[PDB]
Amino acid sequence: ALPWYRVHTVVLNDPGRLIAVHLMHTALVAGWAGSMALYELAVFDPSDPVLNPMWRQGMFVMPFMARLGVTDSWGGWSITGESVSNPGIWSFEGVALTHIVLSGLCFLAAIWHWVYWDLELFRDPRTGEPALDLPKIFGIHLFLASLLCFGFGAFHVTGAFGPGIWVSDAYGVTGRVQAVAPAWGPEGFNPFNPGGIASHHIAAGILGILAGVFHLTIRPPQRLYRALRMGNIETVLSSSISAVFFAAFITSGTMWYGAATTPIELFGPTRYQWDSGYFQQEIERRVEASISEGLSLSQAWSRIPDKLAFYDYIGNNPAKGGLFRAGPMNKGDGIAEAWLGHPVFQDKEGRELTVRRMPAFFETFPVILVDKDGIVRADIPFRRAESKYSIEQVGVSCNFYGGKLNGQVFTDAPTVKKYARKSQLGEVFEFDRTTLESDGVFRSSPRGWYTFGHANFALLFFLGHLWHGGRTLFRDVFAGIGAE
Amino acid sequence: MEALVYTFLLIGTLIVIFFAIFFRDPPRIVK
Amino acid sequence: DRGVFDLIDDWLKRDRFVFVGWSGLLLFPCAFLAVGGWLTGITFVTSWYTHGLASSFLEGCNFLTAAVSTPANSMGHSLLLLWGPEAQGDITRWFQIGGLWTFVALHGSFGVIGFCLRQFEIARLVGIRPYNAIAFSGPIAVFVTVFLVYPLGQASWFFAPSFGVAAIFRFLLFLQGFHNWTLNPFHMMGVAGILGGALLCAIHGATVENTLFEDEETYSMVTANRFWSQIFGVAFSNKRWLHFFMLFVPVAGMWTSSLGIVGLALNLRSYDFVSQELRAAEDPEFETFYTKNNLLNEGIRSWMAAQDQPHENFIFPEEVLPRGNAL
Amino acid sequence: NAGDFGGYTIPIIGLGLIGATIALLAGPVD
Amino acid sequence: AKGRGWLQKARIADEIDVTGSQYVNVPQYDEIGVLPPLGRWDPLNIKGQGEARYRRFVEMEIKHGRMAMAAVLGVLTTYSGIRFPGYLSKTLDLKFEDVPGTMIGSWATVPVTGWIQIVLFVVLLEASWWKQDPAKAPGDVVPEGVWWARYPDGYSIFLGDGSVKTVAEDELFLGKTWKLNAERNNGRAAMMGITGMYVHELLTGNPVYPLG
Amino acid sequence: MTPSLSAFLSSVILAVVIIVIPIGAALVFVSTSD
Amino acid sequence: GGSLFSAMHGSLVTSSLIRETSENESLNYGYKFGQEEETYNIVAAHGYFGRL
Amino acid sequence: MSAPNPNKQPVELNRTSLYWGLLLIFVLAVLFSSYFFN
Amino acid sequence: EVSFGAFLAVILGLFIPVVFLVTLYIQSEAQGTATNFRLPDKAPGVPGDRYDA
Amino acid sequence: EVSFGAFLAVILGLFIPVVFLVTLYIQSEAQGTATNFRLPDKAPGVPGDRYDA
Amino acid sequence: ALRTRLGEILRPLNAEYGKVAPGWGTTSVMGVFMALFLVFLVIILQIYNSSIILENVDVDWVTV
């Protein structure tokens, strides 16, 4: 008589079988984490962390392992590129294998709790019916969670007894796992300050322990117990679902806008770094500093790191992919091989021309060369349009500085047109489109996919909060009402 | 083989529609 | 009753000309400010300093072209509070930078929260199940994803819809040209739900009125089931399943299309079929209706970007503007 | 990296402690 | 005028059943030190050696566990490098920083005249001041008026609004029996901890040898 | 205290003393009256 | 408006269904094909919509 | 305890619900196959 | 470029829920609950009589 | 080169008969005939009594 | 029901079902903590939104 969408409500009044299905879900989730990491370790290429990082290869669980301090592998390599001798058990493979062993043990524990459902612990001594004292259970679980929250902040993050967390510079070129001192001032509320992570978990953990002491000692008010239906297991389901989508909306914005918990060396750059020219402005700032030192343009642009130039490329923008463009970022433009250098375009009048950069909105953007005033000087016309300001007519030459083509000058129109198209996407790079049979359409980073999954999951969990919230407050009439 | 998959999906949908029309649950009026 | 909370609870639920309740403490001021803020914007407030447009009755716009336009792109995702660091308490500068848009959107968002809470409150007061609140979660999901989630994933509040008739019409063609929103399967599920809901409204109202009893039940369910079984092949036999279905399909259409808008916030769009794009690139004679549509999307993007996004200072010469004469 | 924070000591002692407590509580009462 | 009349009005009312009726209160861990995992773990049956001989062992476990808890905290503080400011012996030019934080290092470097003052303070506490009363509970050696944190049954705690809750002896984390049990168990764990830190130091020079 | 922080504090104080407290007082008055 | 009125009417009827089934049985079994009496409480739904 | 569980309930899916589910799954496959393949 | 993973997504994304629905209906037929033209449950676990009976 | 058709042969060659066996057992449980520790049929269509009542 | 060693241990932790504080209890304290949490959440939102610009904290990527 139970419909298909109500089959799991047999567990609603069975605390022993409720632990069993929760242990089974734990076994599947821990099993997924070990399996996802093992599959990811099979397809990971750790050869070049500069132009082929984890986020270019579609690594999903690997950035979260590296964020908390797991950077070495049993194969002798590390995420930073430095060859490691002995990582111990807590390598990438050891973390993956432990989640598999934990999955099997939870699977066996789920079987025991399913079979031995009728425990005296779940029975109310006054009535003999199955009962769960939910306010007391909340105090136990809040105390246990706050102990873990405090211990994670005080020992793991601060490095007192722990590895620390991933920290980097403002441009993501020197990233490493390092102990982080807590920031107790107003700077701890800067989301990009990693010191806030340590100070939050210590402060919130302490307050949660104090709240756990209160919730383990003081019983709920009678009027609050009746209003919130605290004797019903569905009222905590509705409230936990609400807290769950509340967190998922925050972690979606934190991932999308960037924070200290989502570094660009693990998840890739954000779309707002390309919008504001974040890496571009720093690149010209370092070049202009070298020019004032007396270096020529060739050597000034040669000091620019390839990692910094790779960030200033629209193919690394997470807002450039597609919903059904599956696979890694290397499946798109290709696997990055070498920075080609910075092209400088010039007409026959010595005017320095800059290609107008492509906004993330446009799938295709017109190729336009403008001077320092802002007037359009050269063009790449649309297909067979009647050209008047074309590259051939204007006569634009291109000089490359830095990279592989350092010092080279290209003046023939087909190569100038080809590099003007590549200059529209930011820094010019050479790509291996044959290893993965890359098709040339841009894909999204792990930063883009996480936000899509968790903002959509949070939206769907808002619906579940309304449904399970209504089922709690209307439990008496949910089989129907009386005829009047 | 993509067109084969598309054709199989469309023909399967039409088969499901045929079974839903002609092999439906017969409506019986309560007494 | 006993205690000051109980007198307030009794007064709020008292039968008067309009029900108030506890949700009315949030719904009534927020909804009045959102509607009043919108009527203020379409009458007096311009969009000259944010969009380079006239959008008020004071400037000569009519009801179709007036709007409460989105903030300037330089504002980002600022809350644009009246006391915020942008307007700094200046109500005039607040109107000019588009702060009225965030006023209407934020008070409107808390308004629809209060209305859904009102649906929960009256259902508990009357004693019925809260299915109208679940059905209103469809419009909530559409409003939240389109007016909040989509600009929050984009560059700024500027790319959100502006509260106006013709401004919404621009937003339709903007998402078609820039995201190929019609080719998204989530919008397709939304169209099926919304057109199916209009079908269900028309077919149920016609059937009930045409199977009426000449005067318990007012219409013949047996006759209606017999009619549609022989006309269409299948028919409803359960009246309760028929009415859950009338709830389900338009609400599921709202929820499915909202999931695609979230993807469109991060530009995770269904823009292209890659194999069809690659084959047309190597073979210029190949052409389908999807490839013709991507050509029209390029025409939308390049011809509107100069005026739709005036902050970017796009200067597009006639050579780079796509045309049908150059194929 | 191996040998840091006690090496394999704490995971071995911790796993042995969990296994011993489960075996201690496995028997029936009275 | 007695200044304690506001306490009764600020006192929270007794907890009841949700229906409205009075709550029904509705096991083998009666003695302090008898805890859920092992219960009464008495392999040598010291409880069967006599009530006088068992009363001796309760005070003996309490005293041994109390010094071991202080001893463990002392080594963990000094081996970490935490020191008092100034000099330990201005006559011997012994700064606090010069003395090793290790157990054997601190035991030898501290002067014997300094060690005598520690011992004599313990002797003074053991023989006159903190003497065990046979009528009093085991381990209750602090006399009245020596400003000790006590948790009697029904003692008052205070909430955010100023309301007062009375804490029974069986309350979690706040009752007397919880704190009495936690003193005994932390004393038992530090008893094994301090001898383990001694032998790990004897073998490697590191009291916490795997760590560090 | 920056001007934006002072503006936020003023906004919180203004919300409490113009919206919350007057509406609550009006509710208490009309509930005890009726 | 058709989608609005369809969802509105469906939610109003689904809200005021008269109890005829068990604790977690599907409520659609509470309606019998060919029955004469009303399957939902019309006055309760009308009162809800009037107060809404 | 391994007692007979009293919360065990039979599960029901009538032919109409089966047809609705089959139609939903087939139509969803028809809609999303083009996007998965490209 | 036949996307190998896309073929499994279409096949398994169709086969597995179709299998689940077919398995649910067949055991419903065995229990006599695979019709909506039957009375509500007489007792817990006891389906009501069909309208034709 | 991953043989595309070979993956479907392994997957569908395993999934389809496993599905058929699981569906047959589940409807057998609904009829009370999924145990061999029961008596033979007392009548056509009526399964025999189980060994433990 | 089955009695286990761990079940007897955890028995007092699930023995207070239905026990409530009479009346409004500590709801007034809870409302204050909820109001303080609401103000705190608005603060960290407006800091991230740059609607509250603090003294020398900058919402931008930091070094070390």
Ligand code: CLA
């Ligand atoms: C000074 C040490 C000391 C004393 C006097 C007591 C006394 C008591 N204990 Mg403790 N106990 C101790 C240390 C002690 N305990 C330590 C370190 C632990 C943790 C491992 C425990 C764990 C414990 C539990 C779990 C329980 C007791 C119980 C008891 C009571 C009766 C059982 C008994 O007497 O066994 C004590 C046995 C002796 C004193 C034997 C003499 C010392 C032997 C020879 C030590 C063996 C060598 C040792 C490992 C050091 C090695 C050095 C090497 C060079 C030889 C009594 C109050 C029961 C109870 O709590 O009642 C209130 C009970 O259930 N004890």
Ligand SMILES: CC(=O)O[C@H]1CC(C)(C)C(=C=C/C(C)=C/C=C/C(C)=C/C=C/C=C(C)/C=C/C=C(\C)C(=O)C[C@@]23O[C@]2(C)C[C@@H](O)CC3(C)C)[C@](C)(O)C1
């Ligand atoms: C006014 C006044 O006076 O009122 C007083 C009253 C009163 C009640 C006294 C008060 C109190 C409370 C107090 C004093 C509490 C004190 C607590 C204290 C000091 C308790 C330490 C435990 C240490 C343990 C368990 C160690 C075990 C460690 C073990 C088991 C080890 O094996 C150690 C180890 O190294 C080895 C051997 C090998 C290594 O590989 C691993 C590790 C490192 C693990 C007040 C309120 O404060 C004030």
Ligand SMILES: CC1=C(/C=C/C(C)=C/C=C/C(C)=C/C=C/C=C(C)/C=C/C=C(C)/C=C/C2=C(C)CCCC2(C)C)C(C)(C)CCC1
């Ligand atoms: C028993 C045992 C064992 C073993 C174990 C194992 C080996 C495990 C495994 C495990 C595993 C191997 C698991 C896995 C899992 C997975 C999962 C769980 C998945 C899921 C998925 C999903 C859920 C998805 C979905 C989706 C899709 C498809 C699309 C999109 C959307 C989504 C995402 C939703 C050992 C020896 C150790 C020990 C002893 C015992």
Ligand SMILES: CC1=C(/C=C/C(C)=C/C=C/C(C)=C/C=C/C=C(C)/C=C/C=C(C)/C=C/C2=C(C)CCCC2(C)C)C(C)(C)CCC1
């Ligand atoms: C924003 C703002 C605000 C608010 C304000 C408000 C609240 C306002 C209101 C406003 C309003 C509230 C207005 C209104 C208006 C109205 C109107 C404008 C109307 C019109 C009408 C008409 C036109 C009609 C027509 C018709 C129809 C439709 C149908 C039938 C026929 C006839 C003809 C009758 C404040 C102060 C807070 C401050 C900040 C800012």
Ligand SMILES: [Fe+2]
């Ligand atoms: Fe109707």
